[PDB]
From a paper:
The cAMP receptor proteins (CRPs) play a critical role in bacterial environmental adaptation by regulating global gene expression levels via cAMP binding. Here, we report the structure of DdrI, a CRP family protein from Deinococcus radiodurans.
These two domains are interconnected by a long linker α-helix (C-helix; residues 95–121). The NDB of DdrI shares a canonical jelly roll topology with two layers of antiparallel β-strands, and DBD contains a winged HTH motif (E- and F-helices) critical for DNA binding. Importantly, the linker C-helix in the DdrI structure is fully folded, in contrast to the partial folding of this region in ecCRP in the absence of cAMP. Thus, the fully folded C-helix of apo DdrI led us to suspect that our DdrI without cAMP binding represents the active CRP form. Notably, compared with ecCRP apo structure lacking the cAMP, the β4-β5 loop and D-helix show noticeable movement, with the F-helix being in a position compatible with target DNA binding. Instead of interacting with the adenine base as its ecCRP equivalent does, Arg55 of DdrI forms hydrogen bonds with both Tyr113n and Glu65, leading to insufficient space for cAMP accommodation.
Numbering used by the authors:
A (entry chain A), B (entry chain A): 12 to 202
The structure:
Amino acid sequence: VDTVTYRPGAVILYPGKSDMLYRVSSGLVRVHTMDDDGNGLTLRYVKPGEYFGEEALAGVNRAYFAEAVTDSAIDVINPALMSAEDNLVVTTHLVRTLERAYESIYRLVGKRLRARIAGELLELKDTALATQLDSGETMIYATHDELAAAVGSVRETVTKVVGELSREGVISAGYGKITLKDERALATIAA
Amino acid sequence: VDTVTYRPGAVILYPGKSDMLYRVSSGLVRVHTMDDDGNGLTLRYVKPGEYFGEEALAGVNRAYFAEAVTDSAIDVINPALMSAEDNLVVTTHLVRTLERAYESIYRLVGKRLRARIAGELLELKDTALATQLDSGETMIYATHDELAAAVGSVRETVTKVVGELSREGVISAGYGKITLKDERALATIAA
Ligand SMILES: [K+]
Ligand SMILES: [K+]
Ligand SMILES: [K+]
Ligand SMILES: [K+]
Ligand SMILES: [K+]
Ligand SMILES: [K+]
């Protein structure tokens, strides 16, 4: 139906009653909440082609926020107007999204923070937060606070681990930027 | 289509290629995996009326196990044979299941173990693991190892917390059984 643009950091959906279905056409969206200390917790990143606000399909309310991470173009969809073919597409996306939620759970319980940090950097490599340097390396735009929210940690501990991974030579750390110097080694650490 | 019965502890689905869609008609199923130490991790309990094995809809493989917790009757469904009306039902269930996955994440990151244990007992109150004593209290059949897998902890720490909640007078602990003596107080602890 209609496409709306949002600037970085703008809220798309607040917790409350459901309404329409949304799809990322371009950019990057973050579904998140707050913990009991006010610290953020990212539930998932939503890449182009992926849907959010699906609670509209079930009429259930939404308990999360959705915000634009980068400049983003979002398509707004009416669930009733959708055709059966489109419904199959959304269903396929939901299955994949639930599979990613279960992987997030497994990793929260079963992986050390360095493994979670390494996996998250590789995930962000295929998003709008990533750019290719002249060296050919991938650089990710993320602060240590944004990483902490994505892996369920706190800034201070993420900073320590970024320091360790820099000393191991697998990343080069910057100011709100992290260059992936050895993506094979990152995959090994992440597993 | 067809309905199959499984005894307690029997494996319904192994990790591998997807096939059919499954629904619990009676009983209780557990979707789970193993961590890096061999310890179990429950992803969710599946109650009567709820679906599992949805990866069949998307043709993706399954990375989890599904097992019968109690004596259970499971309906096997062919995704292609399904009608559009049935597809809407499964889609609604998926949305709710994803909402429960996100709540699981939030609680793993943001809640202390006593809060997670208390919330889980109240969740199991409406399952086949629950029975009503003559006193009117609800009793749950669960070992401390089964609780640890449901809240992402280890047995030894769950045992300590069960001891604390017993001394606070909110449960009465038994051998593979826990009686909910004060469900209001449990809800307060869980929040
Ligand atoms: K750790
Ligand atoms: K930073
Ligand atoms: K390592
Ligand atoms: K704790
Ligand atoms: K026990
Ligand atoms: K408390």
